[PDB]
Amino acid sequence: EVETFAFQAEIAQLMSLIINTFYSNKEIFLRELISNSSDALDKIRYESLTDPSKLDSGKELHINLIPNKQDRTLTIVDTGIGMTKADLINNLGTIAKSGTKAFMEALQAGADISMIGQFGVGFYSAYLVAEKVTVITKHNDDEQYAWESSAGGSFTVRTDTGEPMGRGTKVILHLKEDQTEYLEERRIKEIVKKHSQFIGYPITLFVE
Ligand SMILES: COC(=O)c1c(O)cc(O)c(Cl)c1CCc1nccn1Cc1ccccc1
Ligand SMILES: [Mg+2]
Ligand code: NA
């Protein structure tokens, strides 16, 4: 069974701006998603300080970058805290409504799309390079779920039948056909080095 939800108006408006902008510095999407992974890895780490059993689902805290030119996908995998179904629906709620609303006001006032993460809505920079985004996630307190959207004003949530993840979040970027550079080793290596290498977790770029 699949549930389909409408985005908040402000989030749909931001998604339409991002997916259609000709903003040239699109590479910032990767910094924003790796930042989200780092924050999620922190969360499970701080939690495990008191409750070490919280790492029973996976002791390794890392980020993997998996390009696939056959599928035209860039996947970012982390073993952070993951999200419950409730988290998946709540995270698209009122904190995200006010952040998107305010980022759009900043852009009108001369701000740069690169500031998106400052309002806590950096995830949506994915749509600079992706026509569809699938988020697979597994939290200790819930089962594995798949969130997905092609920025048409709606997203879906379903229980995920795919391979068990253990714990964490997998973001699958279905790239626009003219954003295939983000499958190239040389390009990903540049972007990580320029914007993300001082993240406090291992970042592994897989070969294809
Ligand atoms: C806990 O954070 C994670 O599991 C996680 C992660 O590990 C790596 C990532 O790239 C992202 Cl986007 C998230 C989720 C970060 C988030 N918090 C609040 C809102 N959203 C965006 C959202 C995007 C899509 C679905 C639900 C939420
Ligand atoms: Mg939209
Ligand atoms: Na291009």
From Swiss-Prot:
Q: Where is this region: Interaction with NR3C1?
A: 1-208
**Domain comment (free text):** The TPR repeat-binding motif mediates interaction with TPR repeat-containing proteins like the co-chaperone STUB1.
Q: How is it modified after translation?
A: ISGylated. S-nitrosylated; negatively regulates the ATPase activity and the activation of eNOS by HSP90AA1.
Specify the domain of life of the species encoding this protein: Eukaryota
Q: How does it assemble?
A: Homodimer. Identified in NR3C1/GCR steroid receptor-chaperone complexes formed at least by NR3C1, HSP90AA1 and a variety of proteins containing TPR repeats such as FKBP4, FKBP5, PPID, PPP5C or STIP1. Forms a complex containing HSP90AA1, TSC1 and TSC2; TSC1 is required to recruit TCS2 to the complex. The closed form interacts (via the middle domain and TPR repeat-binding motif) with co-chaperone TSC1 (via C-terminus). Interacts with TOM34. Interacts with TERT; the interaction, together with PTGES3, is required for correct assembly and stabilization of the TERT holoenzyme complex. (Microbial infection) Interacts with herpes simplex virus 1 protein US11; this interaction inhibits TBK1-induced interferon production.
| Protein name, UniProt field | Heat shock protein HSP 90-alpha
Role this protein plays: Molecular chaperone that promotes the maturation, structural maintenance and proper regulation of specific target proteins involved for instance in cell cycle control and signal transduction. Undergoes a functional cycle that is linked to its ATPase activity which is essential for its chaperone activity. This cycle probably induces conformational changes in the client proteins, thereby causing their activation. Interacts dynamically with various co-chaperones that modulate its substrate recognition, ATPase cycle and chaperone function.
What family does the entry list? Belongs to the heat shock protein 90 family.
- Residues noted as binding ATP in the record, renumbered to the chain: N36, D78, K97, F123
Could you tell me the gene encoding this protein? Answer: HSP90AA1
Q: Where in the cell is it found?
A: Nucleus; Cytoplasm; Melanosome; Cell membrane
Carrying N6-acetyllysine, the residues are K43, K69
The range of the complete sequence contained here reads: 16 to 223 of 732
